[PDB]
Amino acid sequence: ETLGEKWKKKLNQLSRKEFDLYKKSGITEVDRTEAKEGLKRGETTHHAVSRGSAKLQWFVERNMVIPEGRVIDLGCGRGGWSYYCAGLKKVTEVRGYTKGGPGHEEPVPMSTYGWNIVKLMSGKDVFYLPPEKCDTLLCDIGESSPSPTVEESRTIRVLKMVEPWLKNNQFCIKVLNPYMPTVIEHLERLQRKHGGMLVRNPLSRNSTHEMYWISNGTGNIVSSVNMVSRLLLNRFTMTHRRPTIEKDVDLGAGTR
Numbered sequence: 052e053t054l055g056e057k058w059k060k061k062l063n064q065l066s067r068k069e070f071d072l073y074k075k076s077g078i079t080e081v082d083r084t085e086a087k088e089g090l091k092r093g094e095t096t097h098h099a100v101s102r103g104s105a106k107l108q109w110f111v112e113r114n115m116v117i118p119e120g121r122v123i124d125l126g127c128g129r130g131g132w133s134y135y136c137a138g139l140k141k142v143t144e145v146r147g148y149t150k151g152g153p154g155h156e157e158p159v160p161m162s163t164y165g166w167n168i169v170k171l172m173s174g175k176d177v178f179y180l181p182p183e184k185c186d187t188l189l190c191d192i193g194e195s196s197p198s199p200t201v202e203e204s205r206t207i208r209v210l211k212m213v214e215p216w217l218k219n220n221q222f223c224i225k226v227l228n229p230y231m232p233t234v235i236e237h238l239e240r241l242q243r244k245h246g247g248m249l250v251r252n253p254l255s256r257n258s259t260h261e262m263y264w265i266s267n268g269t270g271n272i273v274s275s276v277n278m279v280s281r282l283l284l285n286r287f288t289m290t291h292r293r294p295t296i297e298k299d300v301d302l303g304a305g306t307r
């Protein structure tokens with residue numbers, strides 16, 4: 052039984068009250084107040100459509116993934132990753148795909164900087180999509196479940212699905228459950244082949260063990276995963292630490 056499975060265990064034992072306090076204890080989060088109010092009023096410039104823009108920004112600003120050329124954004128949802136990438140100088144095209152329907156967030160149309168190189172497509176299950184030529188492959192798919200065996204299946208399926216889209220390109224791929232032994236085996240094989248490293252984003256909630264496989268880095272995957280399991284387990288032991296609040300991203304207007 053992995054450290055991660057013990058964390059998962061404990062998480063599942065929490066009351067809703069305890070869960071709600073635990074999930075943000077000591078994390079970082081952006082202040083969405085202004086964006087939500089603006090989106091509520093139909094504003095199409097400046098605002099990120101989700102917390103995802105700031106989440107991907109954290110990786111990009113640290114050069115862990117450097118979006119360039121034609122960017123594919125797998126499970127776009129509202130489009131946070133896509134609209135962010137749209138403003139980056141090296142990026143020439145952004146194609147986002149997402150399931151949508153009941154479920155499942157629909158793309159939100161925006162006119163933030165670079166919106167003209169963006170096409171977001173709903174009604175698209177990426178497990179049935181053939182791979183396309185791209186210079187950057189982004190994927191933020193992986194639905195949490197109380198069952199770590201369900202999550203293991205979802206995670207492995209994502210890893211197998213994204214591989215053909217990796218063509219010596221930049222990438223950032225969510226790994227929903229990185230602690231199950233079989234997932235580690237796949238990750239180790241993929242890292243041998245395509246390189247990169249697994250990284251914990253500080254904007255991730257404590258309610259998920261997700262880490263991101265990014266292209267620009269190196270390191271020991273097992274050590275990084277266990278570090279996260281120890282972090283998340285430690286956060287069970289103390290009174291709720293209020294999250295570190297940061298400014299949300301401002302995404303423009305205009306064409307590129």
Ligand SMILES: C[S@@+](CC[C@H](N)C(=O)[O-])C[C@H]1O[C@@H](n2cnc3c(N)ncnc32)[C@H](O)[C@@H]1O
Nearest residue numbers: 101103126128130131132149150155176177191
């Ligand atoms: C964590 S959200 C992405 C948030 C996005 N990165 C943003 O910045 O707003 C993952 C998205 O994947 C979508 N999704 C889940 N399974 C999918 C599938 N099989 N094919 C396409 N999209 C999927 C979900 O509907 C959800 O909108």
